Amino acid sequence: GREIGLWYAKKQGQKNKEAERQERAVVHMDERREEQIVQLLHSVQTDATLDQQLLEDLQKKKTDLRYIEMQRFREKLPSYGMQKELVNMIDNHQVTVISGETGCGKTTQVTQFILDNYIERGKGSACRIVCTQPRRISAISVAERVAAERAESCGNGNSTGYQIRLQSRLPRKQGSILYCTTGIILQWLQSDPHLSSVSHIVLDEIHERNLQSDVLMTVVKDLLSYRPDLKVVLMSATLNAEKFSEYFGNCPMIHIPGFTFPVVEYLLEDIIEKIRYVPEQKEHRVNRQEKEEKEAIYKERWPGYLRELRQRYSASTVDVVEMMDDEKVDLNLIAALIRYIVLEEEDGAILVFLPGWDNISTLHDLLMSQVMFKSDKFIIIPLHSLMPTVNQTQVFKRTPPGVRKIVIATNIAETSITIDDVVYVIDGGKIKETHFDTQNNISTMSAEWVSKANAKQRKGRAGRVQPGHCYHLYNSLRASLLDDYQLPEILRTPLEELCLQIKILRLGGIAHFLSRLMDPPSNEAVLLSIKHLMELNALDKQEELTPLGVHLARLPVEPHIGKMILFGALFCCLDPVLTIAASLSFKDPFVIPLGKEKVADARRKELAKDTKSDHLTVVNAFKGWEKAKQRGFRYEKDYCWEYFLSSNTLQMLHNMKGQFAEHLLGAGFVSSRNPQDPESNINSDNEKIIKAVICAGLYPKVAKIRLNLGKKRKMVKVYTKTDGVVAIHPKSVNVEQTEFNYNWLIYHLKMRTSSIYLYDCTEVSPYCLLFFGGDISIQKDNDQETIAVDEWIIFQSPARIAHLVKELRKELDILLQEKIESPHPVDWKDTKSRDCAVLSAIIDLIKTQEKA
RNA sequence: GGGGGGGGGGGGUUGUUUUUUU
């Protein structure tokens, strides 16, 4: 049996081991370079008026026609009725929590209330309000809205403005309101730990528990003792908002009623009864913690619910409800519901919430496989971040009464995009969210049930301009068993960047600060992050910042990308390394449409050329886009269209590169703020040096390619040390690649969706891993001499060459430590650049190919 | 693990949530 399997598995294993031992790469250098290396080693080794002005300005503006119209509009908001109570509550208490529903307008009214109250009281110069938003577009839009409501332009020294990354319309210093993302305040804390200039701090959308919001809340709570005059206003979504008050010592709470049109809720049984749905899928027919305790409850009440359901509904409805499955979204039911709505429901747009791209594509194909949806009376817009959302401006445009608009979207339409026309919302109760597994140090993505807050937000997405309907694709039991809120990001993401930020802000011990957070992370995650930072030489054995750790913490990227940036500056390949770092920190510039998917992969592979790297193809795309932009705006548009590239993402990457170069110039690694200065880009034309720098940055993420060849279409397998067998994601340019120069891949993103996937892999060379990898050991295996990196990356090499490489690495680490502790551009004149020069020479003109 | 057998169908090439940095 299982033992019979062994009698052939043991034979199979030996073959794989022998094949791995056969093709093992040979590290060999010519006689001239060996003599040069030994010679080099031997040589080296031996005011009062401002208040009056503001008050008079307000009094004069009170007579403006535009201001009068804006006031008439503002009076309709529910917050206008509670203006006085809000002002008194904020004035009399240090910390207040404001709970409001959708449409209450608290975001654009509370700050105006405080500012106006201070201005009319004759102390307008003491008002400096900062309101933090979770999104850049949200902050920009709110700032423009507040500026419009005040009959003024945003920024330009006026009373309101915004500041986000690489963009700021700053208002006047005193008597102003600033709308910024949450990271801006954390950056301010680096130079101003007390926020002395800030008089009022307003934290928005605290119910969305992201990293920055929680960190800022903890920092403000700690800082309140040192700033008795600071006033904090927390604004939430009136569901589990008492917990925020509890965190701040039972601070006073105030509720602002919402203003929305009524929305009718339909559940799965109601939908099936109403549309008389009959499923044809019958013919065509590893856990966590509380999940498994909610499912126990679902299965104990299922028999009793089906019964209670049999009384309220017909037999067919109960049969369909019972036979429906979980872990999937019934797209046929969604299509039937859409057909029902477009046949005998009133006019209005339909918004469909789906968990992923594949479901959106399947629903789109299902919809236009029918005759009625292929006419000009229907417009179907898929919404997803990877689609050309910048091109998707047709979602906002209204439609004539004879044509209906159907929007199939992910949760991007929950917050980022507002259609303001939707009448019917079809909520598939599945949402894809990312969890971190600290046991295996692997990120996991799966489609989980939507939370109660998510369902409420989706329902409120309808009924903004007229009464609407919401269809939830889950029964009553599932609805009653939903989670109140999604797990906060403190419990789903790695904490290395957070640990570095904690250290750079002098907030105390990492564990001590993290334990004071709302729903603090587990001790295992903290220990893993601290150990990871220690192994990167970013923290000493006493949990303090190393000289490299300071530079990593001051860079707006996670530590591995920061190390890659520093090494690219050191080795004079600044431009491609900065482009790769910007792409890895924020998105790849590639967008795909709904239908033309394989064409996008073909164009990406055409861009990749023979680099066999998912990061050098981004460099090629950026270079081509820059050339097209130089040659013309129209040609830039054609290039972006033909190669399926996002112009906005490319511009943002360019700005991020400029910011990185500015920081590098400030620190002292480079002599200019231009990433394309020739003095810092002498090795930028050599792909081997760029790959070596990539390996130096994100080293420990290595993978081994085993070319078993044989007759299984000469297919390749990918292995990882900590994990087991992994696969290359189809989005990569190496998924179908079978002619690899070297059997080693370096990657950045690795996630487990259904199988462990590598989303961006770059082919790497033996010397890149030798000089920029783990510990080097020299030993003998059977009948050949080997040199190993981390005792699992083995290369063939004679003992003399291996000892030379080990000594060279021992010297290079010291050289890099001195170059990092005291940054300075490297002068390439035979003083101490000899080690770097010979390493560059070895990487450039030694490695040729494998032996397979 | 393979195409050592059809001793089983114990394992078998199975696509991309959203966001943020003086």
Short mmCIF file of all heavy atoms in Angstrom, two decimals, chain A residues 263-264 266 274 337-338 340-353 404-408 419 421-427 458-459 461-464 466-472, unseen atoms left out:
data_model
loop_
_atom_site.label_atom_id
_atom_site.label_comp_id
_atom_site.label_asym_id
_atom_site.label_seq_id
_atom_site.Cartn_x
_atom_site.Cartn_y
_atom_site.Cartn_z
N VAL A 263 -33.16 51.86 1.89
CA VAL A 263 -32.68 50.76 1.06
C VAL A 263 -33.27 49.47 1.59
O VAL A 263 -33.22 49.21 2.80
CB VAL A 263 -31.14 50.68 1.04
CG1 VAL A 263 -30.68 49.49 0.23
CG2 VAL A 263 -30.55 51.96 0.49
N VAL A 264 -33.84 48.66 0.70
CA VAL A 264 -34.46 47.40 1.07
C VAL A 264 -33.41 46.30 0.99
O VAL A 264 -32.69 46.18 0.00
CB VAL A 264 -35.65 47.08 0.16
CG1 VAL A 264 -36.51 46.00 0.78
CG2 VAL A 264 -36.47 48.34 -0.09
N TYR A 266 -32.36 42.41 0.74
CA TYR A 266 -32.79 41.10 0.28
C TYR A 266 -31.68 40.10 0.56
O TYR A 266 -30.51 40.36 0.26
CB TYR A 266 -33.11 41.11 -1.22
CG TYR A 266 -34.24 42.03 -1.61
CD1 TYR A 266 -33.99 43.32 -2.03
CD2 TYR A 266 -35.56 41.59 -1.58
CE1 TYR A 266 -35.02 44.16 -2.40
CE2 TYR A 266 -36.59 42.43 -1.95
CZ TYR A 266 -36.31 43.71 -2.36
OH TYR A 266 -37.34 44.55 -2.72
N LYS A 274 -38.01 35.47 -5.11
CA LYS A 274 -38.51 36.55 -5.94
C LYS A 274 -38.26 36.29 -7.42
O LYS A 274 -39.13 36.56 -8.25
CB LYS A 274 -37.86 37.87 -5.50
CG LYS A 274 -37.89 38.96 -6.54
CD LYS A 274 -37.33 40.26 -5.98
CE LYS A 274 -38.19 40.77 -4.84
NZ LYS A 274 -39.30 41.63 -5.34
N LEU A 337 -30.31 37.25 -11.39
CA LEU A 337 -30.79 38.44 -10.69
C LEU A 337 -30.65 39.68 -11.55
O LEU A 337 -31.55 40.54 -11.57
CB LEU A 337 -30.04 38.60 -9.37
CG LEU A 337 -30.44 39.76 -8.47
CD1 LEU A 337 -31.94 39.75 -8.24
CD2 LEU A 337 -29.70 39.67 -7.15
N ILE A 338 -29.54 39.80 -12.27
CA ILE A 338 -29.34 40.95 -13.16
C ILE A 338 -30.39 40.95 -14.26
O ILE A 338 -30.95 42.00 -14.60
CB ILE A 338 -27.91 40.93 -13.74
CG1 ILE A 338 -26.89 41.32 -12.67
CG2 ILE A 338 -27.80 41.87 -14.91
CD1 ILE A 338 -25.46 41.17 -13.11
N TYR A 340 -33.38 39.62 -14.08
CA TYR A 340 -34.64 39.99 -13.44
C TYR A 340 -34.74 41.50 -13.29
O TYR A 340 -35.78 42.11 -13.60
CB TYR A 340 -34.74 39.30 -12.08
CG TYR A 340 -35.81 39.84 -11.17
CD1 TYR A 340 -37.11 39.38 -11.25
CD2 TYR A 340 -35.52 40.81 -10.22
CE1 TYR A 340 -38.10 39.88 -10.42
CE2 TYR A 340 -36.50 41.31 -9.39
CZ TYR A 340 -37.78 40.84 -9.49
OH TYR A 340 -38.76 41.33 -8.66
N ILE A 341 -33.67 42.13 -12.81
CA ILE A 341 -33.69 43.58 -12.58
C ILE A 341 -33.85 44.33 -13.89
O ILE A 341 -34.65 45.26 -14.00
CB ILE A 341 -32.42 44.02 -11.83
CG1 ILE A 341 -32.41 43.46 -10.41
CG2 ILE A 341 -32.33 45.53 -11.78
CD1 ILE A 341 -31.05 43.50 -9.75
N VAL A 342 -33.10 43.93 -14.93
CA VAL A 342 -33.19 44.64 -16.19
C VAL A 342 -34.50 44.35 -16.91
O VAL A 342 -34.88 45.08 -17.83
CB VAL A 342 -32.00 44.32 -17.11
CG1 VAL A 342 -30.69 44.57 -16.39
CG2 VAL A 342 -32.08 42.89 -17.61
N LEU A 343 -35.22 43.30 -16.52
CA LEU A 343 -36.49 43.00 -17.17
C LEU A 343 -37.66 43.71 -16.50
O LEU A 343 -38.38 44.47 -17.16
CB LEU A 343 -36.72 41.48 -17.21
CG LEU A 343 -36.01 40.72 -18.34
CD1 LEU A 343 -36.74 39.42 -18.63
CD2 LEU A 343 -35.91 41.58 -19.59
N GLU A 344 -37.88 43.49 -15.20
CA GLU A 344 -39.02 44.15 -14.55
C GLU A 344 -38.61 44.81 -13.23
O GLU A 344 -39.22 44.61 -12.18
CB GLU A 344 -40.22 43.21 -14.37
CG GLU A 344 -40.13 42.02 -13.40
CD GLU A 344 -39.14 40.95 -13.80
OE1 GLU A 344 -38.32 41.18 -14.70
OE2 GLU A 344 -39.23 39.83 -13.25
N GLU A 345 -37.58 45.64 -13.28
CA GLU A 345 -37.30 46.60 -12.23
C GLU A 345 -37.11 47.98 -12.85
O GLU A 345 -36.87 48.11 -14.05
CB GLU A 345 -36.06 46.22 -11.40
CG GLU A 345 -36.27 45.02 -10.50
CD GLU A 345 -37.19 45.32 -9.33
OE1 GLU A 345 -37.18 46.47 -8.86
OE2 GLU A 345 -37.92 44.41 -8.90
N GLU A 346 -37.23 49.01 -12.01
CA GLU A 346 -37.16 50.38 -12.49
C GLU A 346 -35.74 50.72 -12.95
O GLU A 346 -34.78 50.00 -12.69
CB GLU A 346 -37.61 51.35 -11.41
N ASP A 347 -35.63 51.84 -13.66
CA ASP A 347 -34.35 52.26 -14.22
C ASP A 347 -33.36 52.61 -13.13
O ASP A 347 -33.73 53.16 -12.09
CB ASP A 347 -34.55 53.45 -15.16
N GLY A 348 -32.09 52.30 -13.37
CA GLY A 348 -31.04 52.57 -12.41
C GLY A 348 -29.83 51.69 -12.59
O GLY A 348 -29.94 50.56 -13.07
N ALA A 349 -28.65 52.18 -12.20
CA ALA A 349 -27.43 51.42 -12.38
C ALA A 349 -27.36 50.27 -11.38
O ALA A 349 -27.93 50.32 -10.29
CB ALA A 349 -26.21 52.33 -12.21
N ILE A 350 -26.64 49.22 -11.77
CA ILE A 350 -26.44 48.03 -10.95
C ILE A 350 -24.97 47.93 -10.61
O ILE A 350 -24.11 48.00 -11.50
CB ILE A 350 -26.93 46.76 -11.67
CG1 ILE A 350 -28.35 46.94 -12.19
CG2 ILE A 350 -26.86 45.57 -10.73
CD1 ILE A 350 -28.84 45.78 -13.01
N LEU A 351 -24.67 47.75 -9.33
CA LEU A 351 -23.31 47.56 -8.85
C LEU A 351 -23.18 46.17 -8.26
O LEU A 351 -23.96 45.79 -7.39
CB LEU A 351 -22.93 48.62 -7.81
CG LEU A 351 -21.51 48.58 -7.25
CD1 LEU A 351 -20.50 48.63 -8.37
CD2 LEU A 351 -21.30 49.73 -6.29
N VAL A 352 -22.19 45.41 -8.74
CA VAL A 352 -21.96 44.04 -8.31
C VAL A 352 -20.60 43.97 -7.63
O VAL A 352 -19.60 44.43 -8.20
CB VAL A 352 -22.03 43.05 -9.49
CG1 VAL A 352 -22.15 41.63 -8.98
CG2 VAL A 352 -23.20 43.39 -10.40
N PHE A 353 -20.57 43.40 -6.44
CA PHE A 353 -19.34 43.25 -5.67
C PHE A 353 -18.85 41.81 -5.77
O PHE A 353 -19.55 40.89 -5.34
CB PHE A 353 -19.55 43.65 -4.22
CG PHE A 353 -19.60 45.13 -4.00
CD1 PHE A 353 -20.81 45.80 -3.98
CD2 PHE A 353 -18.44 45.86 -3.82
CE1 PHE A 353 -20.87 47.16 -3.79
CE2 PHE A 353 -18.49 47.23 -3.62
CZ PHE A 353 -19.71 47.87 -3.61
N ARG A 404 -29.06 51.04 -19.49
CA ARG A 404 -28.70 50.70 -18.12
C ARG A 404 -27.21 50.43 -18.02
O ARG A 404 -26.61 49.88 -18.94
CB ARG A 404 -29.48 49.48 -17.63
CG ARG A 404 -29.53 49.36 -16.12
CD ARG A 404 -30.35 48.16 -15.69
NE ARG A 404 -31.77 48.36 -15.94
CZ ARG A 404 -32.64 48.72 -15.01
NH1 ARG A 404 -32.27 48.94 -13.76
NH2 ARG A 404 -33.92 48.87 -15.35
N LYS A 405 -26.63 50.82 -16.89
CA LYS A 405 -25.20 50.65 -16.63
C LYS A 405 -25.01 49.60 -15.56
O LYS A 405 -25.60 49.69 -14.48
CB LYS A 405 -24.57 51.98 -16.20
CG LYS A 405 -23.08 51.91 -15.94
CD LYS A 405 -22.48 53.29 -15.85
CE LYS A 405 -23.23 54.15 -14.85
NZ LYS A 405 -22.65 55.51 -14.73
N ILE A 406 -24.19 48.60 -15.86
CA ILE A 406 -23.89 47.51 -14.93
C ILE A 406 -22.40 47.58 -14.61
O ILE A 406 -21.57 47.51 -15.52
CB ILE A 406 -24.27 46.14 -15.50
CG1 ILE A 406 -25.66 46.20 -16.13
CG2 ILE A 406 -24.23 45.09 -14.41
CD1 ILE A 406 -26.08 44.92 -16.80
N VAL A 407 -22.07 47.70 -13.33
CA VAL A 407 -20.69 47.83 -12.88
C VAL A 407 -20.35 46.60 -12.06
O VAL A 407 -20.96 46.35 -11.01
CB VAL A 407 -20.48 49.11 -12.06
CG1 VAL A 407 -19.01 49.27 -11.70
CG2 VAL A 407 -20.97 50.32 -12.83
N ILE A 408 -19.37 45.83 -12.53
CA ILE A 408 -18.87 44.66 -11.81
C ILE A 408 -17.54 45.06 -11.19
O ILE A 408 -16.57 45.34 -11.90
CB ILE A 408 -18.71 43.45 -12.74
CG1 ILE A 408 -19.85 43.41 -13.75
CG2 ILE A 408 -18.66 42.17 -11.94
CD1 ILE A 408 -19.64 42.40 -14.85
N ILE A 419 -19.79 55.96 -7.38
CA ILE A 419 -20.51 56.18 -8.62
C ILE A 419 -21.63 57.21 -8.44
O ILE A 419 -21.93 57.98 -9.36
CB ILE A 419 -21.04 54.85 -9.17
CG1 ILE A 419 -19.89 53.87 -9.37
CG2 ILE A 419 -21.77 55.05 -10.48
CD1 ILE A 419 -19.87 52.73 -8.38
N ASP A 421 -24.68 56.96 -8.49
CA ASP A 421 -25.82 56.73 -9.36
C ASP A 421 -26.43 55.36 -9.12
O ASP A 421 -27.51 55.08 -9.63
CB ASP A 421 -25.38 56.88 -10.83
CG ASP A 421 -26.52 56.71 -11.81
OD1 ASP A 421 -27.69 56.97 -11.44
OD2 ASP A 421 -26.26 56.30 -12.97
N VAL A 422 -25.78 54.51 -8.33
CA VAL A 422 -26.21 53.13 -8.16
C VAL A 422 -27.55 53.09 -7.44
O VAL A 422 -27.75 53.74 -6.41
CB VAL A 422 -25.15 52.33 -7.38
CG1 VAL A 422 -25.64 50.93 -7.13
CG2 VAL A 422 -23.84 52.32 -8.14
N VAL A 423 -28.49 52.32 -8.00
CA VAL A 423 -29.77 52.07 -7.37
C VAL A 423 -29.86 50.64 -6.85
O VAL A 423 -30.47 50.39 -5.81
CB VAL A 423 -30.93 52.38 -8.34
CG1 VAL A 423 -32.26 52.33 -7.61
CG2 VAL A 423 -30.72 53.73 -8.98
N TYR A 424 -29.26 49.68 -7.56
CA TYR A 424 -29.28 48.28 -7.17
C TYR A 424 -27.86 47.82 -6.86
O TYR A 424 -26.96 47.96 -7.70
CB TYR A 424 -29.88 47.42 -8.28
CG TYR A 424 -31.19 47.94 -8.83
CD1 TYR A 424 -31.22 48.73 -9.96
CD2 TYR A 424 -32.39 47.64 -8.20
CE1 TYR A 424 -32.41 49.20 -10.46
CE2 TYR A 424 -33.58 48.11 -8.69
CZ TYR A 424 -33.59 48.89 -9.82
OH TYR A 424 -34.78 49.36 -10.31
N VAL A 425 -27.67 47.27 -5.67
CA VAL A 425 -26.39 46.74 -5.24
C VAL A 425 -26.54 45.24 -5.05
O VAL A 425 -27.41 44.79 -4.28
CB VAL A 425 -25.89 47.41 -3.95
CG1 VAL A 425 -24.93 46.50 -3.21
CG2 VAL A 425 -25.23 48.73 -4.26
N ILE A 426 -25.72 44.46 -5.75
CA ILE A 426 -25.71 43.01 -5.63
C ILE A 426 -24.42 42.64 -4.92
O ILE A 426 -23.33 42.69 -5.51
CB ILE A 426 -25.81 42.32 -7.00
CG1 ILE A 426 -27.11 42.70 -7.69
CG2 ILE A 426 -25.71 40.82 -6.84
CD1 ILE A 426 -27.27 42.11 -9.06
N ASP A 427 -24.54 42.26 -3.65
CA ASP A 427 -23.38 42.02 -2.80
C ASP A 427 -23.12 40.52 -2.70
O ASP A 427 -23.80 39.81 -1.96
CB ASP A 427 -23.59 42.63 -1.42
CG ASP A 427 -22.44 42.35 -0.47
OD1 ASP A 427 -21.33 42.05 -0.95
OD2 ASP A 427 -22.65 42.43 0.76
N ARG A 458 -21.54 48.37 1.84
CA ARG A 458 -22.03 48.02 0.51
C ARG A 458 -23.50 48.38 0.36
O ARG A 458 -23.92 48.86 -0.70
CB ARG A 458 -21.82 46.53 0.26
CG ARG A 458 -20.40 46.18 -0.13
CD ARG A 458 -20.03 44.77 0.30
NE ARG A 458 -18.62 44.49 0.08
CZ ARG A 458 -18.16 43.44 -0.58
NH1 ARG A 458 -18.97 42.53 -1.08
NH2 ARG A 458 -16.85 43.29 -0.73
N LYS A 459 -24.31 48.15 1.40
CA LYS A 459 -25.71 48.53 1.35
C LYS A 459 -25.86 50.04 1.24
O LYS A 459 -26.69 50.54 0.46
CB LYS A 459 -26.45 48.01 2.58
CG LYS A 459 -27.73 48.75 2.89
CD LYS A 459 -28.44 48.13 4.08
CE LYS A 459 -28.97 49.19 5.02
NZ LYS A 459 -30.46 49.23 5.03
N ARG A 461 -23.83 51.99 -0.13
CA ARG A 461 -23.40 52.42 -1.46
C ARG A 461 -24.59 52.69 -2.36
O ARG A 461 -24.50 53.53 -3.27
CB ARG A 461 -22.48 51.37 -2.07
CG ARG A 461 -21.79 51.81 -3.35
CD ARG A 461 -20.99 53.07 -3.14
NE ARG A 461 -20.26 53.06 -1.88
CZ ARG A 461 -19.41 54.00 -1.50
NH1 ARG A 461 -19.15 55.04 -2.26
NH2 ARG A 461 -18.81 53.89 -0.31
N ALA A 462 -25.70 52.01 -2.14
CA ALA A 462 -26.95 52.33 -2.80
C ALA A 462 -27.74 53.33 -1.96
O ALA A 462 -27.45 53.57 -0.79
CB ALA A 462 -27.78 51.07 -3.04
N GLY A 463 -28.77 53.90 -2.57
CA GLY A 463 -29.60 54.86 -1.86
C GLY A 463 -28.91 56.16 -1.50
O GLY A 463 -29.06 56.65 -0.38
N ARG A 464 -28.14 56.73 -2.43
CA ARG A 464 -27.54 58.04 -2.24
C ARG A 464 -28.32 59.16 -2.90
O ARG A 464 -28.32 60.29 -2.38
CB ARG A 464 -26.10 58.05 -2.78
CG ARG A 464 -25.22 56.97 -2.19
CD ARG A 464 -24.74 57.35 -0.80
NE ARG A 464 -23.36 56.94 -0.54
CZ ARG A 464 -22.30 57.33 -1.23
NH1 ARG A 464 -22.40 58.20 -2.23
NH2 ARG A 464 -21.10 56.86 -0.90
N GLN A 466 -31.61 58.23 -4.59
CA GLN A 466 -32.99 57.77 -4.66
C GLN A 466 -33.08 56.44 -3.94
O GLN A 466 -32.06 55.78 -3.73
CB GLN A 466 -33.46 57.65 -6.12
CG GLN A 466 -33.26 56.28 -6.73
CD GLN A 466 -33.44 56.29 -8.23
OE1 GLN A 466 -32.77 57.04 -8.94
NE2 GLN A 466 -34.36 55.47 -8.72
N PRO A 467 -34.28 56.02 -3.53
CA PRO A 467 -34.40 54.73 -2.84
C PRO A 467 -33.89 53.59 -3.70
O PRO A 467 -34.10 53.56 -4.92
CB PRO A 467 -35.91 54.61 -2.58
CG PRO A 467 -36.38 56.01 -2.54
CD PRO A 467 -35.55 56.77 -3.53
N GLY A 468 -33.22 52.64 -3.06
CA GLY A 468 -32.57 51.55 -3.76
C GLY A 468 -32.78 50.23 -3.07
O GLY A 468 -33.46 50.14 -2.04
N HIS A 469 -32.18 49.19 -3.65
CA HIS A 469 -32.28 47.83 -3.14
C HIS A 469 -30.89 47.24 -3.01
O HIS A 469 -29.98 47.55 -3.79
CB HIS A 469 -33.13 46.95 -4.06
CG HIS A 469 -34.37 47.61 -4.57
ND1 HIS A 469 -35.63 47.30 -4.09
CD2 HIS A 469 -34.55 48.56 -5.51
CE1 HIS A 469 -36.53 48.03 -4.72
NE2 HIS A 469 -35.90 48.81 -5.58
N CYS A 470 -30.72 46.38 -2.01
CA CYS A 470 -29.47 45.67 -1.79
C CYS A 470 -29.75 44.18 -1.72
O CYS A 470 -30.62 43.75 -0.96
CB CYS A 470 -28.78 46.15 -0.51
SG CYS A 470 -27.08 45.57 -0.33
N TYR A 471 -29.01 43.40 -2.50
CA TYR A 471 -29.17 41.95 -2.55
C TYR A 471 -27.90 41.31 -2.01
O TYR A 471 -26.83 41.42 -2.62
CB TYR A 471 -29.45 41.49 -3.98
CG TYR A 471 -30.59 42.21 -4.67
CD1 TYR A 471 -30.38 43.40 -5.34
CD2 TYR A 471 -31.87 41.69 -4.65
CE1 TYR A 471 -31.41 44.06 -5.97
CE2 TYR A 471 -32.91 42.34 -5.27
CZ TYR A 471 -32.68 43.52 -5.93
OH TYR A 471 -33.71 44.17 -6.56
N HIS A 472 -28.01 40.66 -0.86
CA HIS A 472 -26.89 39.97 -0.23
C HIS A 472 -26.97 38.49 -0.54
O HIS A 472 -28.00 37.85 -0.29
CB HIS A 472 -26.89 40.20 1.28
CG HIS A 472 -26.68 41.63 1.68
ND1 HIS A 472 -27.67 42.39 2.25
CD2 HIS A 472 -25.59 42.42 1.59
CE1 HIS A 472 -27.20 43.60 2.50
NE2 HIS A 472 -25.94 43.65 2.11
#
